[PDB]
Amino acid sequence: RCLCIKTTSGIHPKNIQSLEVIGKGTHCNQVEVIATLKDGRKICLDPDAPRIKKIVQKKLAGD
Amino acid sequence: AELRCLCIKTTSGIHPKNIQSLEVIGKGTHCNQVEVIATLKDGRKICLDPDAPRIKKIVQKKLAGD
Amino acid sequence: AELRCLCIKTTSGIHPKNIQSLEVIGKGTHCNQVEVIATLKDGRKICLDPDAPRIKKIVQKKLAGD
Amino acid sequence: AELRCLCIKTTSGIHPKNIQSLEVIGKGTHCNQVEVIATLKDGRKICLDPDAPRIKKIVQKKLAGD
């Protein structure tokens, strides 16, 4: 079932090395967004937060 | 840095329904470009063009579970 | 927070066949424990117990391509 | 463009203290070999040799978090 127990939306570009977007499925009704930080740690981001939607579009532009 | 950039060749032609997960690697020092790797339903992995409008579209839709 | 592990809950029972890849993240300033995140063939992710002999044996069989 | 095996080249010599994480990718659709990628504390990625005893050993110590 869902990996992501808690989801943050208060983070800025810089610490994020990569992001992984997992689509909803029979074992999780929510989309999961896992960010890999420069330090190797992982955090779950809220996929609906407009802030987080912005962060993705930027990483995607190389900005 | 033995493993550098994974996607020198990309694609814009992917059917969103074949996509299971997406990984967006940001510009790093080791790979000075953004790489986007889609894992397909059958396990295959393909490099996507981060700049193609369509790909930007598909990412935003996946994110919204649209 | 200071302690921000991702793996709150851990399992020891998964059958090797369902595992695609595994990531082992060492102890850090922000996480007092070793985290093992398994990526299943369906794209689902689950935290494994690094201390469980069942788990150590799975890692070894994966490595051996066994 | 399709992504198969990431590791053209491998090494059996890394010092454990430079390793921040390890990813073990089992044999799959598009890569009929096991691949081990270490992410160093400086973010570089190195392909490790999964058959080399020294590597098999590093993985188990990283698991035990020793």
Side-chain angles (χ1 to χ4, degrees):
Chain A
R1 262 65 327 168
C2 310
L3 162 64
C4 296
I5 280 335
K6 301 287 149 78
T7 65
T8 73
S9 88
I11 200 180
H12 266 137
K14 290 341 198 43
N15 302 13
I16 303 171
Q17 149 186 180
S18 64
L19 321 152
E20 197 183 342
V21 176
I22 318 177
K24 39 205 173 190
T26 81
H27 312 289
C28 193
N29 299 321
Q30 293 72 42
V31 166
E32 296 196 296
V33 177
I34 309 188
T36 300
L37 269 18
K38 299 284 185 180
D39 75 349
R41 249 90 278 168
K42 318 272 191 179
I43 55 165
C44 295
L45 310 192
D46 183 347
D48 298 318
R51 176 160 157 132
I52 301 294
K53 305 184 164 291
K54 303 187 176 176
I55 283 179
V56 168
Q57 163 180 232
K58 271 170 59 75
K59 290 272 100 153
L60 195 50
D63 168 43
Chain B
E2 165 115 314
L3 233 218
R4 284 255 289 85
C5 295
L6 318 170
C7 302
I8 292 322
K9 197 175 167 138
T10 55
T11 347
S12 265
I14 27 46
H15 184 118
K17 295 161 155 200
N18 292 331
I19 303 174
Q20 170 174 285
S21 58
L22 280 169
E23 182 176 29
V24 169
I25 314 152
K27 259 172 184 273
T29 52
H30 313 295
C31 178
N32 220 157
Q33 323 137 172
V34 301
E35 311 216 291
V36 175
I37 296 136
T39 309
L40 269 22
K41 304 291 189 204
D42 64 8
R44 287 187 323 154
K45 301 189 206 268
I46 96 140
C47 290
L48 299 179
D49 178 4
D51 295 310
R54 193 183 180 277
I55 299 304
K56 298 178 204 142
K57 288 183 206 274
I58 286 160
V59 168
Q60 270 10 265
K61 275 160 93 313
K62 285 303 171 167
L63 194 53
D66 169 351
Chain C
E2 149 146 53
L3 143 70
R4 64 166 58 197
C5 297
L6 189 194
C7 296
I8 286 334
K9 269 28 202 29
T10 248
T11 181
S12 43
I14 19 73
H15 232 205
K17 218 162 292 184
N18 334 317
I19 302 169
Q20 178 225 78
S21 74
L22 302 138
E23 314 155 48
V24 183
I25 315 166
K27 294 160 145 174
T29 61
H30 306 272
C31 178
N32 38 22
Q33 71 221 34
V34 164
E35 310 183 275
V36 173
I37 310 86
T39 294
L40 267 28
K41 288 179 168 163
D42 75 347
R44 308 285 142 60
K45 289 181 192 278
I46 53 134
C47 290
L48 313 182
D49 185 355
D51 294 321
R54 268 192 89 167
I55 298 307
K56 293 168 185 325
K57 296 206 209 163
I58 272 146
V59 167
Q60 51 198 289
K61 297 201 309 85
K62 276 303 176 161
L63 218 58
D66 168 352
Chain D
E2 196 171 340
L3 207 42
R4 253 70 40 77
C5 299
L6 319 164
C7 300
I8 329 157
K9 277 155 201 53
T10 260
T11 187
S12 323
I14 5 80
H15 185 110
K17 302 223 199 181
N18 290 326
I19 297 169
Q20 153 186 108
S21 72
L22 285 164
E23 181 170 4
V24 182
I25 317 172
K27 296 208 202 199
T29 55
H30 62 351
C31 193
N32 207 174
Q33 60 175 18
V34 168
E35 308 205 300
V36 185
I37 294 167
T39 296
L40 270 58
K41 277 146 168 147
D42 59 14
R44 286 193 301 162
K45 303 194 187 277
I46 281 100
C47 287
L48 310 187
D49 184 355
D51 298 313
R54 169 171 153 199
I55 297 305
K56 293 195 142 152
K57 207 159 288 183
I58 291 189
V59 173
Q60 289 293 318
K61 310 283 212 74
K62 292 309 213 172
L63 222 44
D66 102 64

mmCIF file of all heavy atoms in Angstrom, chain A residues 18-61:
data_model
loop_
_atom_site.group_PDB
_atom_site.id
_atom_site.type_symbol
_atom_site.label_atom_id
_atom_site.label_comp_id
_atom_site.label_asym_id
_atom_site.label_seq_id
_atom_site.Cartn_x
_atom_site.Cartn_y
_atom_site.Cartn_z
ATOM 1 N N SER A 18 16.629 14.442 -7.286
ATOM 2 C CA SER A 18 15.699 13.810 -8.240
ATOM 3 C C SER A 18 14.322 13.583 -7.610
ATOM 4 O O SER A 18 14.185 13.608 -6.365
ATOM 5 C CB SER A 18 16.305 12.528 -8.775
ATOM 6 O OG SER A 18 16.449 11.630 -7.735
ATOM 7 N N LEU A 19 13.351 13.382 -8.508
ATOM 8 C CA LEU A 19 11.957 13.131 -8.050
ATOM 9 C C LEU A 19 11.466 11.887 -8.831
ATOM 10 O O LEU A 19 11.840 11.638 -9.963
ATOM 11 C CB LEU A 19 10.966 14.245 -8.317
ATOM 12 C CG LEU A 19 11.309 15.690 -8.186
ATOM 13 C CD1 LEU A 19 10.459 16.569 -9.112
ATOM 14 C CD2 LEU A 19 11.067 16.118 -6.735
ATOM 15 N N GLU A 20 10.605 11.192 -8.125
ATOM 16 C CA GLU A 20 9.968 9.992 -8.688
ATOM 17 C C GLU A 20 8.454 10.093 -8.468
ATOM 18 O O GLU A 20 7.995 10.263 -7.350
ATOM 19 C CB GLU A 20 10.498 8.737 -8.045
ATOM 20 C CG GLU A 20 10.168 7.545 -8.888
ATOM 21 C CD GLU A 20 10.613 6.233 -8.257
ATOM 22 O OE1 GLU A 20 11.463 6.402 -7.358
ATOM 23 O OE2 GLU A 20 10.095 5.212 -8.741
ATOM 24 N N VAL A 21 7.751 10.011 -9.576
ATOM 25 C CA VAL A 21 6.286 10.082 -9.653
ATOM 26 C C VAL A 21 5.730 8.671 -9.965
ATOM 27 O O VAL A 21 5.939 8.077 -11.003
ATOM 28 C CB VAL A 21 5.899 11.231 -10.612
ATOM 29 C CG1 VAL A 21 4.427 11.356 -10.871
ATOM 30 C CG2 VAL A 21 6.476 12.574 -10.112
ATOM 31 N N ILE A 22 5.023 8.143 -8.951
ATOM 32 C CA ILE A 22 4.392 6.833 -9.007
ATOM 33 C C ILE A 22 2.859 7.068 -9.122
ATOM 34 O O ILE A 22 2.288 7.712 -8.261
ATOM 35 C CB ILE A 22 4.702 5.963 -7.767
ATOM 36 C CG1 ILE A 22 6.202 6.101 -7.352
ATOM 37 C CG2 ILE A 22 4.256 4.471 -7.940
ATOM 38 C CD1 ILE A 22 6.507 5.280 -6.065
ATOM 39 N N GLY A 23 2.331 6.496 -10.178
ATOM 40 C CA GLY A 23 0.894 6.580 -10.496
ATOM 41 C C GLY A 23 0.059 5.723 -9.554
ATOM 42 O O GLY A 23 0.523 4.730 -8.989
ATOM 43 N N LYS A 24 -1.193 6.147 -9.389
ATOM 44 C CA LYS A 24 -2.136 5.411 -8.480
ATOM 45 C C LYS A 24 -2.303 4.009 -8.998
ATOM 46 O O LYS A 24 -2.143 3.760 -10.199
ATOM 47 C CB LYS A 24 -3.397 6.160 -8.258
ATOM 48 C CG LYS A 24 -4.059 6.922 -9.396
ATOM 49 C CD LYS A 24 -4.897 8.053 -8.787
ATOM 50 C CE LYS A 24 -5.500 9.011 -9.777
ATOM 51 N NZ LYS A 24 -6.074 10.194 -8.993
ATOM 52 N N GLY A 25 -2.572 3.075 -8.090
ATOM 53 C CA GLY A 25 -2.734 1.644 -8.497
ATOM 54 C C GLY A 25 -3.558 0.897 -7.450
ATOM 55 O O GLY A 25 -3.924 1.551 -6.438
ATOM 56 N N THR A 26 -3.796 -0.383 -7.693
ATOM 57 C CA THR A 26 -4.606 -1.185 -6.746
ATOM 58 C C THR A 26 -4.067 -1.148 -5.330
ATOM 59 O O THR A 26 -4.889 -1.429 -4.412
ATOM 60 C CB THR A 26 -4.906 -2.660 -7.203
ATOM 61 O OG1 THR A 26 -3.729 -3.494 -6.905
ATOM 62 C CG2 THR A 26 -5.335 -2.766 -8.668
ATOM 63 N N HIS A 27 -2.788 -0.784 -5.146
ATOM 64 C CA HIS A 27 -2.320 -0.768 -3.732
ATOM 65 C C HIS A 27 -2.101 0.611 -3.178
ATOM 66 O O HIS A 27 -1.522 0.697 -2.066
ATOM 67 C CB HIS A 27 -1.096 -1.693 -3.449
ATOM 68 C CG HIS A 27 -1.466 -3.023 -4.094
ATOM 69 N ND1 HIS A 27 -2.418 -3.854 -3.611
ATOM 70 C CD2 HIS A 27 -0.981 -3.550 -5.245
ATOM 71 C CE1 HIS A 27 -2.501 -4.900 -4.444
ATOM 72 N NE2 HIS A 27 -1.642 -4.734 -5.432
ATOM 73 N N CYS A 28 -2.558 1.615 -3.860
ATOM 74 C CA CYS A 28 -2.479 3.004 -3.413
ATOM 75 C C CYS A 28 -3.372 3.853 -4.334
ATOM 76 O O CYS A 28 -3.192 3.859 -5.552
ATOM 77 C CB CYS A 28 -1.050 3.497 -3.289
ATOM 78 S SG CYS A 28 -0.982 5.065 -2.384
ATOM 79 N N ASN A 29 -4.326 4.529 -3.679
ATOM 80 C CA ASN A 29 -5.325 5.366 -4.358
ATOM 81 C C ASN A 29 -4.790 6.793 -4.617
ATOM 82 O O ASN A 29 -5.542 7.595 -5.227
ATOM 83 C CB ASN A 29 -6.654 5.429 -3.593
ATOM 84 C CG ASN A 29 -7.416 4.122 -3.360
ATOM 85 O OD1 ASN A 29 -7.476 3.216 -4.241
ATOM 86 N ND2 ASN A 29 -8.017 4.002 -2.163
ATOM 87 N N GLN A 30 -3.614 7.080 -4.121
ATOM 88 C CA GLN A 30 -3.016 8.403 -4.316
ATOM 89 C C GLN A 30 -1.706 8.250 -5.142
ATOM 90 O O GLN A 30 -1.021 7.233 -5.106
ATOM 91 C CB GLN A 30 -2.740 9.143 -3.045
ATOM 92 C CG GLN A 30 -3.925 9.600 -2.216
ATOM 93 C CD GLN A 30 -4.616 8.420 -1.541
ATOM 94 O OE1 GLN A 30 -3.953 7.506 -1.027
ATOM 95 N NE2 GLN A 30 -5.948 8.406 -1.534
ATOM 96 N N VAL A 31 -1.416 9.310 -5.852
ATOM 97 C CA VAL A 31 -0.177 9.452 -6.639
ATOM 98 C C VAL A 31 0.889 9.720 -5.542
ATOM 99 O O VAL A 31 0.608 10.445 -4.590
ATOM 100 C CB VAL A 31 -0.213 10.594 -7.627
ATOM 101 C CG1 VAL A 31 1.175 10.950 -8.192
ATOM 102 C CG2 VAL A 31 -1.208 10.320 -8.779
ATOM 103 N N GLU A 32 2.040 9.081 -5.742
ATOM 104 C CA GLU A 32 3.131 9.304 -4.729
ATOM 105 C C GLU A 32 4.278 10.010 -5.410
ATOM 106 O O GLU A 32 4.655 9.710 -6.570
ATOM 107 C CB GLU A 32 3.512 8.010 -4.082
ATOM 108 C CG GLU A 32 2.433 7.328 -3.261
ATOM 109 C CD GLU A 32 2.910 6.254 -2.322
ATOM 110 O OE1 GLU A 32 3.411 5.271 -2.873
ATOM 111 O OE2 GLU A 32 2.772 6.409 -1.103
ATOM 112 N N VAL A 33 4.825 11.000 -4.716
ATOM 113 C CA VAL A 33 5.960 11.788 -5.283
ATOM 114 C C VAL A 33 7.022 11.690 -4.181
ATOM 115 O O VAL A 33 6.756 12.187 -3.074
ATOM 116 C CB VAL A 33 5.648 13.249 -5.565
ATOM 117 C CG1 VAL A 33 6.875 14.011 -6.069
ATOM 118 C CG2 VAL A 33 4.468 13.415 -6.513
ATOM 119 N N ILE A 34 8.076 11.041 -4.549
ATOM 120 C CA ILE A 34 9.210 10.843 -3.646
ATOM 121 C C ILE A 34 10.379 11.677 -4.193
ATOM 122 O O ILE A 34 10.745 11.473 -5.381
ATOM 123 C CB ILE A 34 9.522 9.321 -3.543
ATOM 124 C CG1 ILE A 34 8.204 8.578 -3.202
ATOM 125 C CG2 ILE A 34 10.652 8.976 -2.556
ATOM 126 C CD1 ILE A 34 8.438 7.104 -2.897
ATOM 127 N N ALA A 35 10.884 12.544 -3.347
ATOM 128 C CA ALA A 35 12.042 13.364 -3.731
ATOM 129 C C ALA A 35 13.269 12.713 -3.071
ATOM 130 O O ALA A 35 13.179 12.248 -1.947
ATOM 131 C CB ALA A 35 11.918 14.781 -3.261
ATOM 132 N N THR A 36 14.328 12.668 -3.789
ATOM 133 C CA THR A 36 15.636 12.172 -3.344
ATOM 134 C C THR A 36 16.414 13.495 -3.090
ATOM 135 O O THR A 36 16.464 14.327 -4.034
ATOM 136 C CB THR A 36 16.404 11.211 -4.293
ATOM 137 O OG1 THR A 36 15.566 10.031 -4.517
ATOM 138 C CG2 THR A 36 17.738 10.711 -3.672
ATOM 139 N N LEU A 37 16.909 13.671 -1.906
ATOM 140 C CA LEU A 37 17.651 14.909 -1.567
ATOM 141 C C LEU A 37 19.134 14.716 -1.838
ATOM 142 O O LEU A 37 19.653 13.596 -1.909
ATOM 143 C CB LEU A 37 17.281 15.162 -0.120
ATOM 144 C CG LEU A 37 16.088 16.038 0.241
ATOM 145 C CD1 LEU A 37 15.088 16.277 -0.847
ATOM 146 C CD2 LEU A 37 15.443 15.302 1.433
ATOM 147 N N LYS A 38 19.816 15.835 -1.992
ATOM 148 C CA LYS A 38 21.274 15.852 -2.252
ATOM 149 C C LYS A 38 22.010 14.977 -1.231
ATOM 150 O O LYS A 38 23.114 14.452 -1.561
ATOM 151 C CB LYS A 38 21.857 17.241 -2.096
ATOM 152 C CG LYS A 38 21.389 18.351 -2.967
ATOM 153 C CD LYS A 38 21.930 18.317 -4.384
ATOM 154 C CE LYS A 38 21.478 19.572 -5.162
ATOM 155 N NZ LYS A 38 22.062 19.452 -6.545
ATOM 156 N N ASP A 39 21.445 14.850 -0.029
ATOM 157 C CA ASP A 39 22.083 14.030 1.014
ATOM 158 C C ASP A 39 21.671 12.550 0.982
ATOM 159 O O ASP A 39 22.179 11.810 1.887
ATOM 160 C CB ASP A 39 21.951 14.657 2.389
ATOM 161 C CG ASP A 39 20.557 14.504 2.962
ATOM 162 O OD1 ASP A 39 19.662 14.088 2.182
ATOM 163 O OD2 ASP A 39 20.379 14.823 4.149
ATOM 164 N N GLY A 40 20.884 12.124 0.043
ATOM 165 C CA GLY A 40 20.478 10.725 -0.083
ATOM 166 C C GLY A 40 19.181 10.375 0.610
ATOM 167 O O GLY A 40 18.624 9.258 0.402
ATOM 168 N N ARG A 41 18.701 11.287 1.447
ATOM 169 C CA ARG A 41 17.438 11.063 2.181
ATOM 170 C C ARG A 41 16.261 11.093 1.211
ATOM 171 O O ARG A 41 16.463 11.684 0.117
ATOM 172 C CB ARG A 41 17.248 12.182 3.199
ATOM 173 C CG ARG A 41 17.357 11.800 4.641
ATOM 174 C CD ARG A 41 18.635 11.850 5.286
ATOM 175 N NE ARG A 41 19.530 10.726 5.114
ATOM 176 C CZ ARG A 41 20.848 10.861 5.506
ATOM 177 N NH1 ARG A 41 21.100 11.463 6.674
ATOM 178 N NH2 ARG A 41 21.773 10.388 4.679
ATOM 179 N N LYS A 42 15.105 10.556 1.612
ATOM 180 C CA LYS A 42 13.910 10.606 0.732
ATOM 181 C C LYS A 42 12.771 11.254 1.560
ATOM 182 O O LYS A 42 12.776 10.962 2.766
ATOM 183 C CB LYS A 42 13.358 9.310 0.261
ATOM 184 C CG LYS A 42 14.328 8.238 -0.183
ATOM 185 C CD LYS A 42 14.709 8.317 -1.608
ATOM 186 C CE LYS A 42 15.458 7.057 -2.048
ATOM 187 N NZ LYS A 42 15.775 7.201 -3.495
ATOM 188 N N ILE A 43 11.945 12.002 0.938
ATOM 189 C CA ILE A 43 10.796 12.679 1.505
ATOM 190 C C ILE A 43 9.599 12.551 0.528
ATOM 191 O O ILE A 43 9.860 12.442 -0.675
ATOM 192 C CB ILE A 43 10.991 14.207 1.778
ATOM 193 C CG1 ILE A 43 11.445 14.906 0.471
ATOM 194 C CG2 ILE A 43 11.925 14.562 2.944
ATOM 195 C CD1 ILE A 43 11.304 16.450 0.567
ATOM 196 N N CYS A 44 8.387 12.565 1.048
ATOM 197 C CA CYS A 44 7.178 12.490 0.188
ATOM 198 C C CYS A 44 6.578 13.905 0.052
ATOM 199 O O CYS A 44 6.404 14.602 1.042
ATOM 200 C CB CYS A 44 6.147 11.544 0.759
ATOM 201 S SG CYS A 44 6.586 9.817 0.864
ATOM 202 N N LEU A 45 6.303 14.306 -1.163
ATOM 203 C CA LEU A 45 5.754 15.618 -1.496
ATOM 204 C C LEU A 45 4.281 15.447 -1.830
ATOM 205 O O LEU A 45 3.946 14.399 -2.376
ATOM 206 C CB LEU A 45 6.442 16.169 -2.754
ATOM 207 C CG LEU A 45 7.957 16.143 -2.754
ATOM 208 C CD1 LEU A 45 8.506 16.956 -3.897
ATOM 209 C CD2 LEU A 45 8.381 16.728 -1.411
ATOM 210 N N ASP A 46 3.538 16.472 -1.555
ATOM 211 C CA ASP A 46 2.072 16.507 -1.831
ATOM 212 C C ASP A 46 1.901 16.802 -3.294
ATOM 213 O O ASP A 46 2.272 17.940 -3.639
ATOM 214 C CB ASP A 46 1.555 17.633 -0.926
ATOM 215 C CG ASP A 46 0.049 17.783 -1.014
ATOM 216 O OD1 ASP A 46 -0.525 17.196 -1.945
ATOM 217 O OD2 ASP A 46 -0.514 18.461 -0.138
ATOM 218 N N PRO A 47 1.396 15.901 -4.102
ATOM 219 C CA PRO A 47 1.226 16.083 -5.523
ATOM 220 C C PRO A 47 0.253 17.142 -5.968
ATOM 221 O O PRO A 47 0.296 17.615 -7.122
ATOM 222 C CB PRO A 47 0.820 14.688 -6.025
ATOM 223 C CG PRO A 47 0.189 14.030 -4.857
ATOM 224 C CD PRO A 47 0.954 14.557 -3.653
ATOM 225 N N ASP A 48 -0.630 17.561 -5.087
ATOM 226 C CA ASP A 48 -1.672 18.553 -5.359
ATOM 227 C C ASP A 48 -1.277 19.966 -4.968
ATOM 228 O O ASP A 48 -1.948 20.932 -5.420
ATOM 229 C CB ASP A 48 -2.997 18.112 -4.665
ATOM 230 C CG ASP A 48 -3.450 16.779 -5.254
ATOM 231 O OD1 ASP A 48 -3.381 16.601 -6.473
ATOM 232 O OD2 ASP A 48 -3.868 15.944 -4.434
ATOM 233 N N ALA A 49 -0.232 20.048 -4.159
ATOM 234 C CA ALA A 49 0.192 21.435 -3.755
ATOM 235 C C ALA A 49 0.735 22.090 -5.015
ATOM 236 O O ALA A 49 1.612 21.557 -5.736
ATOM 237 C CB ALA A 49 1.099 21.372 -2.575
ATOM 238 N N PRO A 50 0.163 23.259 -5.311
ATOM 239 C CA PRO A 50 0.567 24.062 -6.489
ATOM 240 C C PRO A 50 2.061 24.383 -6.407
ATOM 241 O O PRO A 50 2.795 24.408 -7.409
ATOM 242 C CB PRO A 50 -0.373 25.248 -6.463
ATOM 243 C CG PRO A 50 -1.580 24.777 -5.645
ATOM 244 C CD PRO A 50 -0.895 23.947 -4.519
ATOM 245 N N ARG A 51 2.529 24.597 -5.178
ATOM 246 C CA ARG A 51 3.951 24.867 -4.945
ATOM 247 C C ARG A 51 4.816 23.719 -5.510
ATOM 248 O O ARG A 51 5.800 23.952 -6.218
ATOM 249 C CB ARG A 51 4.284 24.991 -3.470
ATOM 250 C CG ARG A 51 5.774 25.165 -3.197
ATOM 251 C CD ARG A 51 6.021 25.742 -1.839
ATOM 252 N NE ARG A 51 7.394 25.356 -1.449
ATOM 253 C CZ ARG A 51 8.162 26.355 -0.962
ATOM 254 N NH1 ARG A 51 7.535 27.491 -0.623
ATOM 255 N NH2 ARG A 51 9.463 26.174 -0.864
ATOM 256 N N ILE A 52 4.405 22.500 -5.135
ATOM 257 C CA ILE A 52 5.089 21.288 -5.563
ATOM 258 C C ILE A 52 4.872 21.163 -7.058
ATOM 259 O O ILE A 52 5.830 20.728 -7.720
ATOM 260 C CB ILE A 52 4.707 20.001 -4.771
ATOM 261 C CG1 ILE A 52 5.016 20.192 -3.265
ATOM 262 C CG2 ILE A 52 5.442 18.730 -5.286
ATOM 263 C CD1 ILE A 52 6.555 20.331 -3.046
ATOM 264 N N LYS A 53 3.733 21.532 -7.564
ATOM 265 C CA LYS A 53 3.542 21.400 -9.043
ATOM 266 C C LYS A 53 4.519 22.302 -9.781
ATOM 267 O O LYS A 53 5.014 21.957 -10.883
ATOM 268 C CB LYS A 53 2.093 21.585 -9.420
ATOM 269 C CG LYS A 53 1.162 20.604 -8.643
ATOM 270 C CD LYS A 53 -0.258 20.776 -9.135
ATOM 271 C CE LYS A 53 -1.162 19.642 -8.737
ATOM 272 N NZ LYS A 53 -0.811 18.381 -9.445
ATOM 273 N N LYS A 54 4.820 23.440 -9.169
ATOM 274 C CA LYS A 54 5.760 24.446 -9.704
ATOM 275 C C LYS A 54 7.200 23.954 -9.674
ATOM 276 O O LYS A 54 7.928 24.119 -10.664
ATOM 277 C CB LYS A 54 5.580 25.786 -8.962
ATOM 278 C CG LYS A 54 4.082 26.194 -9.140
ATOM 279 C CD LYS A 54 3.799 27.600 -8.583
ATOM 280 C CE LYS A 54 2.338 27.994 -8.868
ATOM 281 N NZ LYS A 54 1.995 29.327 -8.247
ATOM 282 N N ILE A 55 7.587 23.354 -8.572
ATOM 283 C CA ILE A 55 8.896 22.778 -8.338
ATOM 284 C C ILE A 55 9.233 21.739 -9.396
ATOM 285 O O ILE A 55 10.408 21.663 -9.823
ATOM 286 C CB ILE A 55 9.008 22.194 -6.889
ATOM 287 C CG1 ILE A 55 9.204 23.336 -5.851
ATOM 288 C CG2 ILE A 55 10.110 21.120 -6.740
ATOM 289 C CD1 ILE A 55 9.293 22.802 -4.379
ATOM 290 N N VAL A 56 8.258 20.951 -9.832
ATOM 291 C CA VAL A 56 8.474 19.907 -10.820
ATOM 292 C C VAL A 56 8.756 20.461 -12.195
ATOM 293 O O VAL A 56 9.653 20.051 -12.915
ATOM 294 C CB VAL A 56 7.285 18.930 -10.906
ATOM 295 C CG1 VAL A 56 7.473 18.078 -12.153
ATOM 296 C CG2 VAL A 56 7.158 18.139 -9.635
ATOM 297 N N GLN A 57 7.912 21.397 -12.541
ATOM 298 C CA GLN A 57 7.982 22.107 -13.847
ATOM 299 C C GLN A 57 9.324 22.813 -13.952
ATOM 300 O O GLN A 57 9.832 22.931 -15.104
ATOM 301 C CB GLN A 57 6.730 22.966 -13.955
ATOM 302 C CG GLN A 57 6.725 24.065 -14.984
ATOM 303 C CD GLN A 57 5.402 24.846 -14.972
ATOM 304 O OE1 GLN A 57 4.738 25.032 -15.997
ATOM 305 N NE2 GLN A 57 5.049 25.305 -13.755
ATOM 306 N N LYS A 58 9.931 23.273 -12.859
ATOM 307 C CA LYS A 58 11.215 23.969 -12.880
ATOM 308 C C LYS A 58 12.416 23.040 -13.056
ATOM 309 O O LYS A 58 13.335 23.338 -13.819
ATOM 310 C CB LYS A 58 11.525 24.736 -11.599
ATOM 311 C CG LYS A 58 10.992 26.193 -11.643
ATOM 312 C CD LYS A 58 11.105 26.814 -10.239
ATOM 313 C CE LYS A 58 12.591 26.781 -9.811
ATOM 314 N NZ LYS A 58 13.270 27.874 -10.589
ATOM 315 N N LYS A 59 12.347 21.951 -12.296
ATOM 316 C CA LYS A 59 13.392 20.920 -12.319
ATOM 317 C C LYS A 59 13.468 20.396 -13.771
ATOM 318 O O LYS A 59 14.518 20.110 -14.312
ATOM 319 C CB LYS A 59 13.153 19.747 -11.419
ATOM 320 C CG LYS A 59 13.217 19.853 -9.943
ATOM 321 C CD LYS A 59 14.565 19.646 -9.325
ATOM 322 C CE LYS A 59 15.277 20.924 -8.967
ATOM 323 N NZ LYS A 59 16.239 20.725 -7.821
ATOM 324 N N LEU A 60 12.279 20.306 -14.326
ATOM 325 C CA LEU A 60 12.025 19.815 -15.683
ATOM 326 C C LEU A 60 12.541 20.745 -16.757
ATOM 327 O O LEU A 60 12.752 20.324 -17.915
ATOM 328 C CB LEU A 60 10.513 19.541 -15.720
ATOM 329 C CG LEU A 60 9.956 18.715 -16.838
ATOM 330 C CD1 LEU A 60 10.761 17.424 -16.999
ATOM 331 C CD2 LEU A 60 8.492 18.393 -16.492
ATOM 332 N N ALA A 61 12.727 22.010 -16.383
ATOM 333 C CA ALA A 61 13.225 23.037 -17.326
ATOM 334 C C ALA A 61 14.733 23.245 -17.117
ATOM 335 O O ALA A 61 15.396 23.898 -17.927
ATOM 336 C CB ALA A 61 12.454 24.336 -17.143
#
